Amino acid sequence: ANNLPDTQSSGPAHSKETPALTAVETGATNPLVPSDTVQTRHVIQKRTRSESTVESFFARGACVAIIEVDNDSKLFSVWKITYKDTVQLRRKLEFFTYSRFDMEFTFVVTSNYTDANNGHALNQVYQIMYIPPGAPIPGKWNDYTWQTSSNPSVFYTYGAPPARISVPYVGIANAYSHFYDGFAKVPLAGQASTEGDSLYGAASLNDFGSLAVRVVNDHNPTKLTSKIRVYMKPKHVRVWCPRPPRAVPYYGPGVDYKDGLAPLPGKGLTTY
């Protein structure tokens, strides 16, 4: 996040040192600066790379999900936690193979009457319950699971500033894997083809669990719908192994492609 070096003045040359010539076969990039190939003046550099630090690049709340609940089973909804339901944050994360950070979740809740001239309801309160992989998932908008004696819940009152909570680095590995070239199972010799088969590039069937959202108020016959837009921001970021960015449209959770396979336009070789 710092300063750039100054440009030193450089005069003419006539020597056996040729920085302009190189050999990219080695796998290295030629570290030339302007003064290597032209005469330069002294410039005191004041520009910095403060905004391109790994932290500043991700320091934005991106939408990862839009959970919908109809307060007239739709009285409650469950969202399997992921960053792949949307494309924008996903593409930025995928510039790297591994990552490690904390997360900040902000929830923007909106609601409205479906009918322009019918129904009425008192102010709604929402419960956003996190169900860690293993915990019982709600079957009804009002069954015993909503007691949350151990699961973390967030109760949001409609109209209040967006709710917000922080989550630590929760991975079971030392870093989050954006790419996993493997399987969760190894098919063994002799077992039925139905056996030992698993998805390519998938780890746990339930990585991070899911969110169960519901309106706590008793539902009125009035037609109402609410949407909880989930925004996530990685804070305290560290990333490893850069990768080229996604060039063609995403086709699922994997690196699969199908449709926009011809991303580049035509342009004449000798056309400026």
Binding site: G266, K267, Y272
Partner: protein
């Protein structure tokens, strides 16, 4: 509001225009009104018609911009791409900018590739039975293949085999011929209807026959 009609064939050779009409309602009129065109297209991120004050050619040398610019109008602008090779699709977009809400528009695209030419030839001598007299409907030069249709006068038509496409320079070529069997007369207005949907009414070529001895 956005009302672009551009779903255009699009004729090849070429050349034809690539228009963009944005009719403006009507009591909340639009500025700033710069117009952008993004191709579709390996767009990272330019082959662009942009027009701030003076029309700027983002480098695709083969372009023509015709709008009442450097002043204002605003934009029912027309573009043109010549030429003259099939730098095809893909697709094209047309996006505007606005002081009110309108830094936005719609992607809109279509066709290209090219029209054909036709002639009729009829021979040879009738030693039957029982094929060709013989009328051939040659169709030279059209990448999107022209639907050649041999018909005539009677039920002596069901007999129409095709030369498929062994393509010339970028452009596809075919030949439908008949066959039509045997025997005598000259003499009928046997008409080959070659289409392609360009020009005016489809290429209707009527001919005769080689009658011998």
């Amino acid at each position: 509001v956005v009302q672009a009609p551009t779903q255009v064939p699009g004729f090849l050779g070429d050349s034809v225009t690539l228009p963009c009409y944005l009719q403006v309602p009507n009591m909340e009129v639009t500025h700033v009104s710069q117009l952008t065109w993004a191709r579709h297209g390996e767009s990272g991120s330019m082959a662009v018609f942009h027009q701030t004050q003076g029309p700027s050619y983002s480098e695709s040398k083969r372009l023509e911009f015709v709008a009442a610019r450097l002043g204002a109008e605003l934009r029912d602008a027309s573009l043109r791409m010549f030429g003259l090779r099939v730098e095809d699709e893909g697709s094209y977009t047309c996006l505007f900018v606005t002081f009110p809400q309108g830094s936005r528009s719609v992607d809109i695209w279509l066709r290209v590739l090219a029209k054909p030419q036709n002639t009729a030839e009829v021979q040879k001598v009738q030693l039957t039975g029982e094929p060709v007299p013989m009328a051939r409907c040659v169709s030279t030069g059209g990448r999107p293949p022209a639907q050649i249709t041999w018909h005539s006068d009677l039920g002596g038509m069901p007999q129409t085999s095709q030369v498929p496409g062994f393509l010339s320079g970028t452009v596809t070529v075919t030949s439908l011929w008949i066959l039509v069997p045997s025997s005598q007369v000259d003499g009928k207005q046997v008409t080959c209807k070659v289409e392609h949907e360009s020009f005016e009414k489809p290429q209707l070529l009527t001919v005769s026959l080689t009658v011998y001895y």
